[PDB]
Design a protein around this motif. Structure first.
Motif, PDB file in Angstrom:
ATOM      1  N   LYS A 125      -0.478   2.970  -4.186  1.00 16.92           N
ATOM      2  CA  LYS A 125       0.836   2.455  -3.827  1.00 16.92           C
ATOM      3  C   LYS A 125       2.019   3.168  -4.501  1.00 16.92           C
ATOM      4  O   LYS A 125       1.864   3.854  -5.505  1.00 16.92           O
ATOM      5  CB  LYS A 125       0.886   0.984  -4.167  1.00 16.92           C
ATOM      6  CG  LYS A 125       0.976   0.706  -5.634  1.00 16.92           C
ATOM      7  CD  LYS A 125       1.035  -0.786  -5.811  1.00 16.92           C
ATOM      8  CE  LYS A 125       1.069  -1.160  -7.276  1.00 16.92           C
ATOM      9  NZ  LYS A 125       0.927  -2.636  -7.408  1.00 16.92           N
ATOM     10  N   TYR A 168       1.706   1.667   0.648  1.00 16.48           N
ATOM     11  CA  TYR A 168       0.546   0.923   0.172  1.00 16.48           C
ATOM     12  C   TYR A 168      -0.639   1.196   1.085  1.00 16.48           C
ATOM     13  O   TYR A 168      -0.590   0.942   2.269  1.00 16.48           O
ATOM     14  CB  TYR A 168       0.862  -0.562   0.111  1.00 16.48           C
ATOM     15  CG  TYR A 168      -0.174  -1.403  -0.619  1.00 16.48           C
ATOM     16  CD1 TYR A 168      -1.399  -1.710  -0.035  1.00 16.48           C
ATOM     17  CD2 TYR A 168       0.109  -1.966  -1.847  1.00 16.48           C
ATOM     18  CE1 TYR A 168      -2.297  -2.540  -0.663  1.00 16.48           C
ATOM     19  CE2 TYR A 168      -0.816  -2.750  -2.500  1.00 16.48           C
ATOM     20  CZ  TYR A 168      -2.024  -3.029  -1.914  1.00 16.48           C
ATOM     21  OH  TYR A 168      -2.951  -3.828  -2.595  1.00 16.48           O
ATOM     22  N   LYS A 227      -5.619   2.831  -8.037  1.00 14.90           N
ATOM     23  CA  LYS A 227      -6.733   2.253  -8.727  1.00 14.90           C
ATOM     24  C   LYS A 227      -7.920   2.171  -7.824  1.00 14.90           C
ATOM     25  O   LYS A 227      -7.808   2.342  -6.618  1.00 14.90           O
ATOM     26  CB  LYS A 227      -6.366   0.871  -9.214  1.00 14.90           C
ATOM     27  CG  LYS A 227      -6.115  -0.102  -8.127  1.00 14.90           C
ATOM     28  CD  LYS A 227      -5.930  -1.463  -8.740  1.00 14.90           C
ATOM     29  CE  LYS A 227      -5.543  -2.440  -7.646  1.00 14.90           C
ATOM     30  NZ  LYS A 227      -4.873  -3.599  -8.292  1.00 14.90           N
ATOM     31  N   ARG A 274      -2.327 -11.174   0.431  1.00 18.07           N
ATOM     32  CA  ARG A 274      -1.941  -9.898   1.001  1.00 18.07           C
ATOM     33  C   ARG A 274      -2.457  -9.931   2.423  1.00 18.07           C
ATOM     34  O   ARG A 274      -3.439 -10.590   2.688  1.00 18.07           O
ATOM     35  CB  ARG A 274      -2.576  -8.714   0.266  1.00 18.07           C
ATOM     36  CG  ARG A 274      -2.388  -8.680  -1.241  1.00 18.07           C
ATOM     37  CD  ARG A 274      -1.138  -7.879  -1.546  1.00 18.07           C
ATOM     38  NE  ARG A 274      -0.785  -7.854  -2.973  1.00 18.07           N
ATOM     39  CZ  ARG A 274      -0.081  -8.796  -3.607  1.00 18.07           C
ATOM     40  NH1 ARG A 274       0.347  -9.880  -2.971  1.00 18.07           N
ATOM     41  NH2 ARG A 274       0.182  -8.659  -4.895  1.00 18.07           N
TER      42      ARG A 274
HETATM   43 ZR   LIG Z   1      -1.741  -5.052  -6.105  1.00 18.48          ZR
END
Ligand SMILES: [Zr+4]
Length: 173
Positions: A121, A102, A130, A77
């Motif tokens: 997201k 995101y 989370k 990422r």
């Molecule tokens: Zr993820």
């Protein structure tokens, strides 16, 4: 399905005077909570790790490694600094199919033992969040585990959406 709603960002603190250089390196995911995270008695959740490397332009390359199906799975990422230090957004979001929003926010860290990070997201127009409890090692104090539980509940998650992955050696060493 049904999803516990994302909390408003106002309930999610930002670490003051975030230090991006000190946040670099390997972090173990010692605790995991969210609205698409369920405690699984059958095949319980394995610990994975996430490495943050600061690029010249001050974005992170973020690599995670999980052990799955007899191998190491890597995913990458790019976190792009947002409005204030310790907030990020996802780089190159066009390239993630289904994905429209995101957001990452580092809630707290002492840099050399632990950190709490919040993720939000929107994927297929469903809102997921989370929280990872990160440790520089694979175990943390009970005190910090309880604070991670207190915080997760303050965002509306019940006990069974809070998980403490089992330590392992494969891949994440
Ligand atoms: Zr993820």
């Amino acid at each position: 399905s049904d999803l516990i709603p994302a909390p408003p960002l106002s309930k999610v603190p930002l670490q003051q005077n975030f230090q991006d250089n000190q946040f670099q390196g390997k972090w173990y995911v010692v605790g995991l909570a969210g609205n698409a995270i369920l405690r699984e008695d059958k095949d319980p959740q394995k610990m994975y790790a996430t490495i943050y490397e600061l690029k010249e332009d001050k974005s992170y390359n973020v690599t995670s490694v999980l052990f799955r199906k007899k191998k190491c799975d890597y995913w990458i990422r790019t976190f792009v600094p947002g409005s204030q230090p310790g907030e990020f957004t996802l780089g190159n979001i066009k390239s993630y199919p289904g994905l429209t929003s995101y957001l990452v926010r580092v809630v707290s860290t002492n840099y050399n033992q632990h950190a709490m990070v919040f993720f939000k997201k929107v994927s297929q127009n469903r809102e997921y969040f989370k929280i990872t409890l990160y440790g520089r090692t694979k175990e943390l104090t009970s005190e910090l585990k309880e604070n991670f539980i207190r915080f997760s509940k303050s965002l509306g998650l019940p006990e069974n959406h809070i998980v403490f992955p089992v330590p392992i050696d494969q891949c994440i060493d």
